[PDB]
């Protein structure tokens, strides 16, 4: 379980062997924006309660 979407994507991009055309800092910055991170947090909470039942 990764709490931060930016960390999950960084690990997925490395695993997939893909590098951004912008920069990894610009990509992370975008994924660390409060709205997108919270959407990720709420999706996770939802999926956890789906596992729990």
């Amino acid at each position: 379980m990764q709490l931060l979407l930016s960390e999950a994507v960084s690990r997925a991009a490395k695993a997939a062997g893909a590098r951004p055309l912008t920069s990894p800092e610009s990509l992370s910055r975008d994924l660390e924006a409060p709205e997108v991170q919270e959407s990720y947090r709420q999706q996770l909470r939802s999926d956890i309660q789906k596992r729990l039942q």
């Binding site: 990764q2 709490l3 999950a8 994507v9 997939a16 055309l21 994924l31 959407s39 999706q43 956890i48």
Partner: protein, 46 residues
């Protein structure tokens, strides 16, 4: 709206189209695997 839709747009903004989809699939597989390995301690770190 949903987060996978948000993520899909962000990746398309930073990766080539082919790369963006591949990252997103890998992200979902990673995510799926983390759910399969979920523990009570993980939940409590939310």
């Amino acid at each position: 709206p949903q987060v996978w839709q948000l993520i899909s747009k962000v990746l398309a903004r930073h990766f080539s189209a082919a790369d963006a989809s591949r990252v997103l699939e890998q992200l979902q597989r990673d995510y799926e695997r983390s759910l399969s390995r979920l523990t009570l301690d993980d939940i409590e770190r939310l």
